[PDB]
C-alpha cells in the first residue's frame, strides 16, 4: 500500500497481524497458552503453544504435546482450548 494511503499510527488490524511480530508498531508475540485435556481424563493442564518439552499429564502419564520446529503438536486424543 502507498505510504500516503495509510496512517502509521492507526494501521489496519489485518496488516498488523500480517507484519512480523517484532516489526509491529508495538511488539507482541504470536504465541499463546492453552488448556489441554486428554481423551478420558478430566484433568486439565496448561500448555505453551510452542512448548519445547514433552508435557506429560501427571494422572495417567500420557504425553500431551510433542515439540516441533514451531508450534507443539498435540496428541490425537487430547484437545485444547485457547487460554486468555
Amino acid at each position: 500500500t502507498l505510504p500516503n494511503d495509510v496512517d502509521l499510527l492507526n494501521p489496519p488490524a489485518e496488516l498488523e497481524k500480517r507484519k512480523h511480530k517484532l516489526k509491529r508498531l508495538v511488539q507482541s508475540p504470536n504465541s499463546f497458552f492453552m488448556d489441554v485435556k486428554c481423551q478420558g481424563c478430566f484433568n486439565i493442564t496448561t500448555v505453551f503453544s510452542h512448548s519445547q518439552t514433552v508435557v506429560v499429564c501427571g494422572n495417567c502419564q500420557t504425553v500431551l504435546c510433542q515439540p516441533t520446529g514451531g508450534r507443539a503438536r498435540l496428541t490425537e486424543g487430547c484437545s485444547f482450548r485457547r487460554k486468555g
Binding site: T45, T46, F48, Q52, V55, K83
Partner: peptide, 11 residues
Amino acid sequence: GVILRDSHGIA
C-alpha cells in the same frame, strides 16, 4: 524458565 513456561503456565 523453560519448564515453568511450558508446564506451570508461568510465561
